[PDB]
């Protein structure tokens, strides 16, 4: 069946199929006592949009201006953002539009299909793969749980910094042991952080001889979301590399941060020039770790399954195996191929190239640039097929991302 995106208006009635009131996945944490439930919309099978601010972790629980020293000088705060029905509908439409954009190229469509289908490896109960809260969200009505519906990804609005974007895996052992975990994403389609890149096709003073200089650009929020979707994919496969750092001075992996280092999960997820000279030692170790984790799960869990149900079908589609019920083995060659796709081929920089989107050269930015607001729902500014770089308007070849474009609106900070 061809992937379609379900459209919604925020005021669409609850149906228990695609429109629910969702209990927070992190409801058991003390900081989330009494929160929700929140209206949620199933945009793609197992992918839900919740038009609420993300405030469900320690670092996102307070939406006010931080009481500590600020981590990012390009952050912008507004505790009231996304508290009205009209802002919630705008957000919902924006996320849907960005997803339609992503689906409009085969690489983006395949990414969405992968997230939809790649359920975490369930626990086994009475010989059957059986769902947990690591693979579902609860539809809560009047302090009763009506149903538990499958979910691999829940997309929310931003946390405290309304121009920040992030991914959170639900359970921290499954995120890295090969099982996989439901992910939450905090996403901001309308508030964007600019970046610098060298460029030559812009209005320039006649007295400047050499026109190719660093210029300011806005990112395409589809690229921003795809970046998070790559983290989500790692999280669903249980292959997150959050607890390793790559040291650019030595070219080695380290367990703790160093002066000129980057978290390895971000190095891979962003891609680009910085991932082109990773050592064979590093790549071999990463592959071996994942292979070992999967071999262990196939032995200790998958081979305890005695009941063939739909969850087993979905898991066999996710995890390349050979053999029969009770005696599966990892399909080494197919697993390696799939792993190397998800780790080394799937990344923001490669995806952006396929979408004709400009991204920055390095994951880490050299300087903060004040965030902007842009109404991406206006097709004159941002289209599903071309983003900001609209050919019929003369904005192809990255020109539509130039920050001087009128649709990138200054924020009073
Ligand atoms: Zn990232």
Author numbering: 1 to 413
The authors write:
In the first form, data from a single crystal were collected up to 1.35 Å resolution and the structure of LC/X was solved using molecular replacement with LC/B as a template. Residues 1–413 were clearly defined, however no electron density was observed for the N-terminal tag and the C-terminal end (414–439), all in solvent-accessible areas. The active site of LC/X has the overall conserved geometry shared with other BoNTs. The Zn2+ ion is coordinated by the triad His227, Glu228 and His 231 and a fourth coordination provided by a water molecule linked to Glu266. The water molecule provides the nucleophile base required for the proteolytic activity. Interestingly, access to the catalytic pocket of LC/X appeared more restricted than in LC/B, and /F. The catalytic pocket of LC/X shows a narrow entrance flanked on one side by loop 57–60, composed of polar residues (Thr-Asn-Asn-Thr), and on the other side by the short 261–263 β-strand. Deeper within the cleft, residues 160–165 form a β-strand that borders the catalytic channel, with the S sub-pocket delineated by residues 235–242. On the other end, the S’ sub-pocket delimited by loops 192–195 and 360–365 is well conserved, and may help stabilise the interaction with the C-terminal end of the substrate upon binding. In addition to loop 195–217, a major difference was observed for one of the loops involved in SNAP-25 binding by LC/A known as loop-2507, which in LC/X makes a three-stranded β-sheet arrangement from residues 243 to 263 and extends away from the catalytic channel, in a structural feature unique to LC/X. Loop-250 was shown to take on a different conformation in LC/A where it went from an open configuration in its free form to a closed configuration upon substrate binding.
